[PDB]
Coordinates of C-alpha atoms in Angstrom, one line a residue:
Chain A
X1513 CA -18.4 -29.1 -19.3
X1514 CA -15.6 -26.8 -20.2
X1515 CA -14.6 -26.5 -16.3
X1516 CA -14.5 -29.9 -15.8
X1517 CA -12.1 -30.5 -18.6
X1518 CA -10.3 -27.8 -17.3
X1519 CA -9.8 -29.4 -14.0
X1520 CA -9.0 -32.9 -15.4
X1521 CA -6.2 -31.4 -17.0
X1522 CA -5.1 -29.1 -14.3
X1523 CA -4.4 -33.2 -12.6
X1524 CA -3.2 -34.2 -15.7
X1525 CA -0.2 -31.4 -15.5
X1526 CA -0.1 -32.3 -11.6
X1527 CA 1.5 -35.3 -13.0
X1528 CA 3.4 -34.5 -15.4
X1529 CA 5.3 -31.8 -13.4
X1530 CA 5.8 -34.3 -10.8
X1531 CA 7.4 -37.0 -13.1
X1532 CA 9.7 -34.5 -14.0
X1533 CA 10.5 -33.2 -10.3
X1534 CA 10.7 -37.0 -9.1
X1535 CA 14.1 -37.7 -8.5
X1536 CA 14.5 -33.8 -6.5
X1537 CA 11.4 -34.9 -4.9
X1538 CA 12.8 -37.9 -3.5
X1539 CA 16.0 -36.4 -2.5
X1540 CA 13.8 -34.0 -0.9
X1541 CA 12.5 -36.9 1.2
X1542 CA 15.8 -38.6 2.2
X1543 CA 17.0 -34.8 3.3
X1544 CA 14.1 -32.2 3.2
X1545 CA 11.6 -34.6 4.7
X1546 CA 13.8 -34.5 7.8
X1547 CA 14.9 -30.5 7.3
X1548 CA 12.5 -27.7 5.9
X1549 CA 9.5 -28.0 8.1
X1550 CA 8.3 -24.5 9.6
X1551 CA 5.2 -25.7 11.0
X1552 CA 6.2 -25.6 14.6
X1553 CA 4.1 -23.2 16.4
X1554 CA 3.9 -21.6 20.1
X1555 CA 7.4 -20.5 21.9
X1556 CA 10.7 -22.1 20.9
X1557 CA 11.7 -25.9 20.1
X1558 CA 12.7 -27.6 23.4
X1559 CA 13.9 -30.9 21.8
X1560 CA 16.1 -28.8 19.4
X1561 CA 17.8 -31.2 16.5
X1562 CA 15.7 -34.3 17.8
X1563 CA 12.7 -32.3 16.4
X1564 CA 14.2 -32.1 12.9
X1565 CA 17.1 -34.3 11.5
X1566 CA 15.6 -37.0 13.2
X1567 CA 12.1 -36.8 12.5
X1568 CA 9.3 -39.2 11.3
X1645 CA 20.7 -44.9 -1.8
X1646 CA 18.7 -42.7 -3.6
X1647 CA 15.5 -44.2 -2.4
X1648 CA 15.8 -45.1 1.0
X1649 CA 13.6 -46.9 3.1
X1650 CA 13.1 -47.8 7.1
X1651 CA 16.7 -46.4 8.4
X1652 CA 16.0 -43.3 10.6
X1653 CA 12.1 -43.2 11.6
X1654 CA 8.7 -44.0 10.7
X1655 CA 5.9 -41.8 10.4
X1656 CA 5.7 -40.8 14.5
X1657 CA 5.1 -36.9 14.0
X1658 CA 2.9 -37.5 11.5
X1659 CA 4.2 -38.2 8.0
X1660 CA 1.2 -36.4 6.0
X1661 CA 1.6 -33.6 8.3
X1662 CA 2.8 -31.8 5.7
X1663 CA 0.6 -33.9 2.8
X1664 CA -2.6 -32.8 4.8
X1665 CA -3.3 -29.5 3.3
X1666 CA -0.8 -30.2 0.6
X1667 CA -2.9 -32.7 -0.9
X1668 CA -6.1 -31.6 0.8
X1669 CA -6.3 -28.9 -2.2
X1670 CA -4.8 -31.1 -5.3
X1671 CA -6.4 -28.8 -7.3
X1672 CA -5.1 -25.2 -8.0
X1673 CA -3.0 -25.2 -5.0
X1674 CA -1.1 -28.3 -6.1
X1675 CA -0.4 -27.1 -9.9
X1676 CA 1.5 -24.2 -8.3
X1677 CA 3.5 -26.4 -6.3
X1678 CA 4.0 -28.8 -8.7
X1679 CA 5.7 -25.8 -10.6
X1680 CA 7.8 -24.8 -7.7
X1681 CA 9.2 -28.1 -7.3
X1682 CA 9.9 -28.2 -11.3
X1683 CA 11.7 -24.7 -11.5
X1684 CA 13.4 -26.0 -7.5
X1685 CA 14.7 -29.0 -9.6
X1686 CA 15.3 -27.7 -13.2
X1687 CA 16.8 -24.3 -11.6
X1688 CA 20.0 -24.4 -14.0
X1689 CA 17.4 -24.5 -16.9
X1690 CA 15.9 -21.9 -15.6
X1691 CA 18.8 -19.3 -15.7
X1692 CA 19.3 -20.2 -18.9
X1693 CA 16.1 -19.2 -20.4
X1694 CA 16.0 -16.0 -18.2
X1695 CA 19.5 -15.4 -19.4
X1696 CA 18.4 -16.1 -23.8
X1697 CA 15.3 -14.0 -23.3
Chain B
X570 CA -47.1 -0.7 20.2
X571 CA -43.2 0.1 20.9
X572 CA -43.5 3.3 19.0
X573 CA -45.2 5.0 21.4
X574 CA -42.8 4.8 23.9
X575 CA -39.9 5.3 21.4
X576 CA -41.6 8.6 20.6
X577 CA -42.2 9.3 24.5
X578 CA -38.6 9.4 23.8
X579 CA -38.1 10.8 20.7
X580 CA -38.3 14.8 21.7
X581 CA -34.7 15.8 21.7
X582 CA -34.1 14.9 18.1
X583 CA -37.4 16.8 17.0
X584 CA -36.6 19.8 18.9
X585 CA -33.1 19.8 17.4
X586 CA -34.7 19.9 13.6
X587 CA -37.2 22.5 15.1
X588 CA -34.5 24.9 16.4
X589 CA -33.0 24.2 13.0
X590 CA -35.8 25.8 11.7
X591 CA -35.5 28.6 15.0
X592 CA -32.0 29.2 13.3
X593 CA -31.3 31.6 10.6
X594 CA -34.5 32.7 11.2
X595 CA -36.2 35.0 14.4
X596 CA -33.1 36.6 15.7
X597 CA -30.2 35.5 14.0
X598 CA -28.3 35.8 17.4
X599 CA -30.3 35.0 20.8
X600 CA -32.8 32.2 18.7
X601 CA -30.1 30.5 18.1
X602 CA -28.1 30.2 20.9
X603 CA -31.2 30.1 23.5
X604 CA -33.0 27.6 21.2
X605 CA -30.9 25.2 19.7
X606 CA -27.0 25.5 21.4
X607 CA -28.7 26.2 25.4
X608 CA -30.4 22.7 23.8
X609 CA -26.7 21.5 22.9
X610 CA -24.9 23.1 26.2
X611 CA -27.5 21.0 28.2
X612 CA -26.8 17.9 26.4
X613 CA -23.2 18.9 27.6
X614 CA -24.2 19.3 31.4
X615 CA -25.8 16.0 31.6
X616 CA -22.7 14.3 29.6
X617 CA -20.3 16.8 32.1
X618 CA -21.7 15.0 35.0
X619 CA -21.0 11.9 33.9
X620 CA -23.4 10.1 35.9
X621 CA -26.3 11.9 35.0
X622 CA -26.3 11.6 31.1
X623 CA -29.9 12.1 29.9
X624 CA -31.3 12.3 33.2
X625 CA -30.3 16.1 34.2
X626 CA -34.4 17.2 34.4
X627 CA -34.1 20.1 36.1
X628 CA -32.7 22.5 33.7
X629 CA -33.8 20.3 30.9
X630 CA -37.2 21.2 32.5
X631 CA -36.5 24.9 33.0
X632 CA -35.7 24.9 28.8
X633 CA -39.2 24.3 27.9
X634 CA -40.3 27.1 30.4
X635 CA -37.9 29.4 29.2
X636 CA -38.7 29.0 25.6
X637 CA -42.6 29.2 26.7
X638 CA -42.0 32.5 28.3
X639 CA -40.3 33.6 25.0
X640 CA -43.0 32.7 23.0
X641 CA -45.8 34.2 25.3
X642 CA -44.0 37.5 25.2
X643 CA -43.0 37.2 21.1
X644 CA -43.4 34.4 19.2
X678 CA -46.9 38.2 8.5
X679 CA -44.8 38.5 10.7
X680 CA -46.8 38.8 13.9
X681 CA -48.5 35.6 12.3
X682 CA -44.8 34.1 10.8
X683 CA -43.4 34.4 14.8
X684 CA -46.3 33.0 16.6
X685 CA -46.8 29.9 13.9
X686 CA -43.0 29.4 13.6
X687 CA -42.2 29.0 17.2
X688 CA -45.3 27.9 18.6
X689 CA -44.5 25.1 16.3
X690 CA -41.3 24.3 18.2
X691 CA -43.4 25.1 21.8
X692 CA -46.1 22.9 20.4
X693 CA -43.5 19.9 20.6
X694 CA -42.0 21.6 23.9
X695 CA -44.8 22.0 26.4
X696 CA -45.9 18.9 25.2
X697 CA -43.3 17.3 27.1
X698 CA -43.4 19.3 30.1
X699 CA -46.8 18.2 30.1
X700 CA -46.6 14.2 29.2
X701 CA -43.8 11.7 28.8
X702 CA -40.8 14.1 29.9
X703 CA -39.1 11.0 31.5
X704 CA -38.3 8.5 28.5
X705 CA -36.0 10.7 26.8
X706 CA -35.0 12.2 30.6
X707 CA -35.9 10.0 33.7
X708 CA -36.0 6.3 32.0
X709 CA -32.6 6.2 29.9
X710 CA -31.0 6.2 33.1
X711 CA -27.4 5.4 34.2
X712 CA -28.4 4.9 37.7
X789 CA -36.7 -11.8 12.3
X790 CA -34.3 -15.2 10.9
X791 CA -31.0 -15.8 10.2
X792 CA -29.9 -13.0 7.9
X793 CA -31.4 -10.5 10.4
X794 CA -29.9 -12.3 13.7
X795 CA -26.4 -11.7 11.6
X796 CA -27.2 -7.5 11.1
X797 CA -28.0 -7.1 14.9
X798 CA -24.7 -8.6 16.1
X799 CA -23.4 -6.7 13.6
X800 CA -25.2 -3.2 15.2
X801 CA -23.3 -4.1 18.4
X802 CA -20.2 -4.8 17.6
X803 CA -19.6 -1.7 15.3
X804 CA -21.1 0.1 18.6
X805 CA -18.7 -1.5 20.7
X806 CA -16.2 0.2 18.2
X807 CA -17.9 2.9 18.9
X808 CA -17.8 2.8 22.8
X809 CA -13.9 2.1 22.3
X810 CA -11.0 4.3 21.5
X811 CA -11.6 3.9 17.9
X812 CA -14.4 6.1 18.2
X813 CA -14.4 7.8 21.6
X814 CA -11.7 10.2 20.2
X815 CA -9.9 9.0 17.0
X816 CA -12.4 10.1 14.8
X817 CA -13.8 13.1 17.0
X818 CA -10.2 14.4 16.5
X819 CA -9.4 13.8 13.1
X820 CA -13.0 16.3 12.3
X821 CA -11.9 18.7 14.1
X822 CA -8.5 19.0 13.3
X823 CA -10.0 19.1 9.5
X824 CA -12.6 22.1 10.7
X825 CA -10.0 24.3 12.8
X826 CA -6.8 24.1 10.9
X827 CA -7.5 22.9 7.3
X828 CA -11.0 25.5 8.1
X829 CA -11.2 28.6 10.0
X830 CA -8.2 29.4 11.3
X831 CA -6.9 32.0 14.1
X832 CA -9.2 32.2 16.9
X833 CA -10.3 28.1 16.8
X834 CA -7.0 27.2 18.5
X835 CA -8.9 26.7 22.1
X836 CA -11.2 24.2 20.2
X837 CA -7.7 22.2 18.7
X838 CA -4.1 22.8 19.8
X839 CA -4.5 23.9 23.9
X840 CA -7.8 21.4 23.8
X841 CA -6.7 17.9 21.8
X842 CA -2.9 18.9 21.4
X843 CA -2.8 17.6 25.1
X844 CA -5.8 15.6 25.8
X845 CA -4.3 13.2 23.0
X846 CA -1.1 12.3 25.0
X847 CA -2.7 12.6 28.7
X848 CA -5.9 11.0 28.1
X849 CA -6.5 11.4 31.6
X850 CA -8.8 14.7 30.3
X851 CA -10.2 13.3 27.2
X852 CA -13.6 13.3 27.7
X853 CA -13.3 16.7 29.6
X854 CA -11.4 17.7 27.1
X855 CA -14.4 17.2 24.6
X856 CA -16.8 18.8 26.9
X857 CA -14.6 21.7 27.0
X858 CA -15.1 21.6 22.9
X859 CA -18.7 21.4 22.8
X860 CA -18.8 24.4 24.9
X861 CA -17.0 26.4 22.7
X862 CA -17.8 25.6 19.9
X863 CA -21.1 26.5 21.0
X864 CA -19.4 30.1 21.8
X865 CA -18.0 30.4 18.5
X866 CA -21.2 30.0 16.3
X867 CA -22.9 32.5 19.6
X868 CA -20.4 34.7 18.1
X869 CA -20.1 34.7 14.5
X870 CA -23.9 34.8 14.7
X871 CA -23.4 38.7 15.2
X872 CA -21.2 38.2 11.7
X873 CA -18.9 41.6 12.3
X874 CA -20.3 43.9 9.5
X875 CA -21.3 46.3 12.1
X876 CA -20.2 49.4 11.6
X877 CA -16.8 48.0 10.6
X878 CA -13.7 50.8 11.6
X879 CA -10.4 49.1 10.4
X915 CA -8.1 43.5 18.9
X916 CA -6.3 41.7 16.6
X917 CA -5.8 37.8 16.5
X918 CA -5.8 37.3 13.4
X919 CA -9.3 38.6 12.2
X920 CA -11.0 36.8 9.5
X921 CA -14.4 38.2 10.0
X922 CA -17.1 36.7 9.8
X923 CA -18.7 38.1 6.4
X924 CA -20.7 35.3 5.2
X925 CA -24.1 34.4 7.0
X926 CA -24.7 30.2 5.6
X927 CA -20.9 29.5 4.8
X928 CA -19.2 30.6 7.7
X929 CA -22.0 29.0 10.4
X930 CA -21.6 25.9 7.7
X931 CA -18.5 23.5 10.0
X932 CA -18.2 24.3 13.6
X933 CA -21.9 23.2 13.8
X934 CA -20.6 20.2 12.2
X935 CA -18.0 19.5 14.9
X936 CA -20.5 20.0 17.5
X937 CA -23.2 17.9 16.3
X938 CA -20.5 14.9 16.4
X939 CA -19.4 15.6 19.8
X940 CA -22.9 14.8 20.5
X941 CA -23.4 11.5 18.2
X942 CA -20.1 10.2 19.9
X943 CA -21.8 11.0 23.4
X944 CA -24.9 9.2 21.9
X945 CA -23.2 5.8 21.1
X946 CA -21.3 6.6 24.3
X947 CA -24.1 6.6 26.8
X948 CA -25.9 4.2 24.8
X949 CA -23.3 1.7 25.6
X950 CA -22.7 2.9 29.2
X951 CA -26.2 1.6 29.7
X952 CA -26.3 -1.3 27.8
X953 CA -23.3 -1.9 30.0
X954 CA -25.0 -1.0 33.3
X955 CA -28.3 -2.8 32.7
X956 CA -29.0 -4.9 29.7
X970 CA -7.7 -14.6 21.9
X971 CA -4.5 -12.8 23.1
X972 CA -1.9 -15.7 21.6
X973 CA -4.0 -18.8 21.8
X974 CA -6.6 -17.9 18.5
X975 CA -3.7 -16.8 17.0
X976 CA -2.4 -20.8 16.3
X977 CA -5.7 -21.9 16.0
X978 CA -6.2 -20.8 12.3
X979 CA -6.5 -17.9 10.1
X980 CA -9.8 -17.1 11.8
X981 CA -8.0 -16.9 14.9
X982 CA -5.1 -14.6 13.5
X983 CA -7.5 -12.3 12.4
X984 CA -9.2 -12.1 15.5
X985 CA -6.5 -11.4 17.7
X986 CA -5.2 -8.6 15.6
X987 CA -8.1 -6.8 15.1
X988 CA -8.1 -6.6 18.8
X989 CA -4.6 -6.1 19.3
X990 CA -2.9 -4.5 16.1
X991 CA -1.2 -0.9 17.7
X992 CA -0.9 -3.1 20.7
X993 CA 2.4 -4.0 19.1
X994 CA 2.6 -2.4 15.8
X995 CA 2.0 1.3 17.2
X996 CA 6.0 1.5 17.6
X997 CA 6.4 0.6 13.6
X998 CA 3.1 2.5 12.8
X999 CA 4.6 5.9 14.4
X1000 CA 7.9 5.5 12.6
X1001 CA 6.3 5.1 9.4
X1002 CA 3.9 8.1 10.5
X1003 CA 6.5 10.6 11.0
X1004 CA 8.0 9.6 7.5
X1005 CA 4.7 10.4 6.1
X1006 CA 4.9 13.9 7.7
X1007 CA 8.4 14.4 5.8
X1008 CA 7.0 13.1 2.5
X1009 CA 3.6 15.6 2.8
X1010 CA 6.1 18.8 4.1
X1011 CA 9.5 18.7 3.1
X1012 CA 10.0 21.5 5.1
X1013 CA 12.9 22.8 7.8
X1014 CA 9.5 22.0 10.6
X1015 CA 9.7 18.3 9.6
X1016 CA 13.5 18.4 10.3
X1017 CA 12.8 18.6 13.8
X1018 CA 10.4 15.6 13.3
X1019 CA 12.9 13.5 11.2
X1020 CA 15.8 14.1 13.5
X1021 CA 13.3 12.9 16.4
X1022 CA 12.9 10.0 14.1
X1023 CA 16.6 9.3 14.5
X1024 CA 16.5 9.9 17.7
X1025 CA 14.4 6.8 19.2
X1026 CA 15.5 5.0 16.1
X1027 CA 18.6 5.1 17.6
X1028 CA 16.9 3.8 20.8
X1029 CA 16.8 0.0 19.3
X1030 CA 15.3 -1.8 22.3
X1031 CA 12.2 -1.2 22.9
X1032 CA 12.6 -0.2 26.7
X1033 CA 14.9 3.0 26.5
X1034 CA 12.3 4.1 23.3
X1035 CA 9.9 3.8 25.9
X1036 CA 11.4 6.2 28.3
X1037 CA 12.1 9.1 25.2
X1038 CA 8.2 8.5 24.8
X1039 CA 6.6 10.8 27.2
X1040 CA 9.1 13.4 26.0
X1041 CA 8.7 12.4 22.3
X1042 CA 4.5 13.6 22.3
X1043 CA 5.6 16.5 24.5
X1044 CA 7.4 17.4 21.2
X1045 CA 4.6 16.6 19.1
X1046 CA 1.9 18.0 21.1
X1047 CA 4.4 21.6 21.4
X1048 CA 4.7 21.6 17.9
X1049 CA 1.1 21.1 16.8
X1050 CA 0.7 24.4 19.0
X1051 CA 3.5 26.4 17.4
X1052 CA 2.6 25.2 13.9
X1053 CA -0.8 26.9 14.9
X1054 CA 1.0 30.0 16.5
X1055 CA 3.1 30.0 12.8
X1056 CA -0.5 29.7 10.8
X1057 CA -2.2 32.3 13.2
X1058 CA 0.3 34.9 14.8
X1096 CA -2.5 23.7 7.1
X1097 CA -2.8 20.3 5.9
X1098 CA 0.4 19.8 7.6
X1099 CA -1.3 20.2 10.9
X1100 CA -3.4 17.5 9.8
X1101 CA -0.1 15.1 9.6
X1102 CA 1.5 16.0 12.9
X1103 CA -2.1 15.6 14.5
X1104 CA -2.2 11.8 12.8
X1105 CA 1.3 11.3 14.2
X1106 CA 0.6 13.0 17.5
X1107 CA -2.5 10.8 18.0
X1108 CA -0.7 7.6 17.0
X1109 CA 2.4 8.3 19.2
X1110 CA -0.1 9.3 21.8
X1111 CA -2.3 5.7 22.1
X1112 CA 1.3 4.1 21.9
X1113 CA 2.7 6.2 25.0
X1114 CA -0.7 4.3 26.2
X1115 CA 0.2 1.1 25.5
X1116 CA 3.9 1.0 25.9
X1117 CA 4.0 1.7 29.8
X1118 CA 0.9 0.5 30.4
X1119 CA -1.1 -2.3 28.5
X1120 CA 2.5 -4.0 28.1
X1121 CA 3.7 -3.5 32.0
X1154 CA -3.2 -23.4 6.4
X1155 CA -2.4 -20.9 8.6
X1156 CA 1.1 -22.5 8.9
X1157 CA 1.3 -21.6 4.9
X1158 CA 0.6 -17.9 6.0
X1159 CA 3.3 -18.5 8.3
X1160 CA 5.3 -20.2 6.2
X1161 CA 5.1 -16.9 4.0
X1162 CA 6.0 -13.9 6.8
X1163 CA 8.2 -16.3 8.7
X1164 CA 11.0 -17.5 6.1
Chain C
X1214 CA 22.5 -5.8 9.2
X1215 CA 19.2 -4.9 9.4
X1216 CA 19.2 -1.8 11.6
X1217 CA 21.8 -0.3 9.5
X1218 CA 20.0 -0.9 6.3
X1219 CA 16.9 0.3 8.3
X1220 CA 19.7 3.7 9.0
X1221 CA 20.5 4.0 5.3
X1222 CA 17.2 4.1 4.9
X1223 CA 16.2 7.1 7.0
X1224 CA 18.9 8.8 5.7
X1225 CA 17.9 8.7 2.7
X1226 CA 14.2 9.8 3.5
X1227 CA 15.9 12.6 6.1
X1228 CA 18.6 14.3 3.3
X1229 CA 15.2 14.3 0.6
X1230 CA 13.2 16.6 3.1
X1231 CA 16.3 18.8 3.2
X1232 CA 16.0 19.1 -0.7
X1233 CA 17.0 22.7 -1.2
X1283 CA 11.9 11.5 -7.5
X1284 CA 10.3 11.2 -4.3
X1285 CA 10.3 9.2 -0.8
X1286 CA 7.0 7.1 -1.7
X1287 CA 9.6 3.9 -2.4
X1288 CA 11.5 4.6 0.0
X1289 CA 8.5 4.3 2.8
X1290 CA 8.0 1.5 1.1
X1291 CA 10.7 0.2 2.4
X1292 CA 10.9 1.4 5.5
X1293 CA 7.7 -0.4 5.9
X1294 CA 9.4 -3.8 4.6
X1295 CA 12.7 -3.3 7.1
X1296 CA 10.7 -2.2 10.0
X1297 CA 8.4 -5.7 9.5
X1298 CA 11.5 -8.0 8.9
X1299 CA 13.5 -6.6 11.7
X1300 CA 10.3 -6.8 13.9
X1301 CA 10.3 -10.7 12.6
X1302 CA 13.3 -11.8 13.9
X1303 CA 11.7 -13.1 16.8
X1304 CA 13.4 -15.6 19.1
X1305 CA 10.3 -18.2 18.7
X1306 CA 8.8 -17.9 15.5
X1307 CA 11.9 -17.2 13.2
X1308 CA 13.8 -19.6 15.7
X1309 CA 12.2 -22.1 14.5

């Protein structure tokens, strides 16, 4: 069915915009992994930069933590809608990575 | 059979529609009043009690036996009085003489899925109804509309001395609205007499009351929803009588919603007056909204919410004051309408602020970064 | 910041009703301010 193909290819472009994003993507996981979180809920943050920097070259492995508060906390919903959801954030990390690009096609147009 | 018992009850409504039919109609004065608004300033006694709503008998008794004696005496013309009101007398001695106590001494204060979904959905709209929302939000916001934006002049005891100071001491609220039915009821006794008698052009600002349908047309309106918000009031009260503040709100978005539909002006009310008195400014633009605007300053200079709290009381003072001078101005406007919104905003917050106060994570992620 | 940005704002909104365009944006952004100064909590934008 038309959908269907649709959908397949909504994946397929997944992909492709995260083959372009991977190296951001990993840097994002050697640094971002352990910053941007905002999921924290309730009153304040008692364990204040246990709870953040050290949470859970270029690709690095087992030198800070594991997985302890929940690795996927974050890939849960993230990848719990890899349709729709996940083409939009797919482009966010592209334009995140590519942002010099970006200015200069805003800047031609 | 349950509709025999519902129309053992059913007697008020059917005399209302038959001293509909009394109105305009007989005498254009007494029938009216004695008929249908002696009908409506008994539904007030019982509701002015407030422990006896729909069980006041006595007078409600003495109504039929009044309108029995009118008939015997009066009520073609010989034939159009006798069958018109002895078709309202028909349905009145008929309770006198069966069933009086459904409607009067029994409503006491003392199908599958899809239809299981539309009665919870009755109850909690009523609830609504029970609460604030409707008590005297919406009550208001028709009068307002039918005494300034409508006949002007003489309705000021029916608006700014009535809900001009009910609204910030709700202490007299509901007497307040009792107050209202009552005159209201007075009014339409008096415009019934239009004033085309022998006219010799005391003054507060006359209008007159030249046209017969038109002019009776709104204050009738105004009372009739005093009484449907007294309905779903006592309703309640004796569904009452016989018959999550933080912790939904990090459970999901479910839970968010829930706990702001139940607490919204809780804490926005401060924001939600500021951005109320800019919406007077914008709909006046005026030298009367620059005493609103520089009130506006004023607790926006406050900052913390405490020391607003303490220019509150003094803050609807100004706003309740200037609903009645506005009135004064228009007598002695849609902009009454404005200040009345921000009055009765300002007002519920003076009534929380010293006194109720003494994938979600996506959403979150959205108002919170 | 915000509370004087929040000022300019009403100034602006309280110099247009003494005219002598419109304030529909600028509500609009009262609206905005008054929400972002409300959300600098010390919990929630803490975190």
């Amino acid at each position: 069915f038309l959908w269907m193909l649709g959908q397949a290819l909504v994946d397929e472009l997944t992909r492709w915009l995260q083959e372009f994003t991977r190296h951001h993507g990993t840097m994002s996981d050697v640094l971002r992994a352990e910053r941007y979180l905002l999921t924290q809920e309730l009153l304040q943050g008692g364990e204040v930069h246990r709870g953040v920097l050290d949470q859970l070259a270029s690709e690095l492995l087992l030198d800070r933590r594991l997985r302890i508060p929940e690795l996927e906390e974050a890939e849960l919903f993230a990848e719990g809608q890899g349709r729709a959801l996940r083409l939009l954030r797919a482009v966010y990390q592209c334009v995140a990575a590519h942002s010099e690009l970006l200015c200069y096609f805003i800047i031609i147009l | 059979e349950l509709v025999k018992g519902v129309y053992a009850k059913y007697w008020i409504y059917v005399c209302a529609g038959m001293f509909i039919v009394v109105s305009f109609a007989g005498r254009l004065v007494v029938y009216k009043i004695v008929y249908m608004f002696l009908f409506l300033l008994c539904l007030t006694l019982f509701q002015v009690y407030y422990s006896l709503w729909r069980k006041l008998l006595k007078a409600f008794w003495w109504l039929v036996v009044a309108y029995t004696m009118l008939v015997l005496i009066a009520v073609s013309e010989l034939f159009s009085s006798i069958l018109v009101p002895g078709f309202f007398l028909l349905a009145c001695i008929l309770q006198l003489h069966y069933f009086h106590r459904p409607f009067m001494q029994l409503t006491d204060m003392e199908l599958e899925l899809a239809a299981g979904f539309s009665d919870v959905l009755s109850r909690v709209q009523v609830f609504l109804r029970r609460l604030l929302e409707l008590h005297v939000f919406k009550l208001v916001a028709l009068y307002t509309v039918w005494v300034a934006l409508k006949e002007v002049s003489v309705m000021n005891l029916l608006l700014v001395v009535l809900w001009a100071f009910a609204l910030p001491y709700p202490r007299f609220r509901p007497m307040a609205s009792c107050l209202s039915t009552v005159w209201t009821c007075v009014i339409i006794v008096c415009k019934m007499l239009y004033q085309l008698k022998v006219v010799n052009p005391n003054w507060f600002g006359v209008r007159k009351g030249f046209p017969n349908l038109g002019y009776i047309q709104n204050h009738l309106q105004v009372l009739l929803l005093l009484v449907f918000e007294a309905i779903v009031y006592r309703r309640q009260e004796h569904y009452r009588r016989q018959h999550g503040t933080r912790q939904q709100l990090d459970q999901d978005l479910l839970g968010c919603l829930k706990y702001f539909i139940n607490f919204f002006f809780y804490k926005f009310g401060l924001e939600i007056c500021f951005l109320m008195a800019v919406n007077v400014i914008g709909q006046r633009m005026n030298f009367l909204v620059t005493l609103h605007g520089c009130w506006l300053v004023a607790i926006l200079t406050r900052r913390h919410r405490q020391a607003i709290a303490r220019l509150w009381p003094n803050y609807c003072l100004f706003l309740a004051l200037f609903l009645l001078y506005q009135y004064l101005l228009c007598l002695g406007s849609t902009n009454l309408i404005s200040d009345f919104l921000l009055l009765l905003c300002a007002s519920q917050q003076w009534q929380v602020f010293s006194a109720e106060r003494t994938y979600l994570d996506m959403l979150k992620v959205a108002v919170f970064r | 910041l915000w509370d004087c940005l929040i000022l300019y704002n009403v100034t602006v909104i309280i110099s247009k009703n003494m005219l002598s365009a419109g304030i529909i944006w600028d509500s609009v952004c009262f609206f905005f301010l008054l929400l972002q100064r409300r959300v600098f909590l010390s919990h929630y934008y803490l975190h």
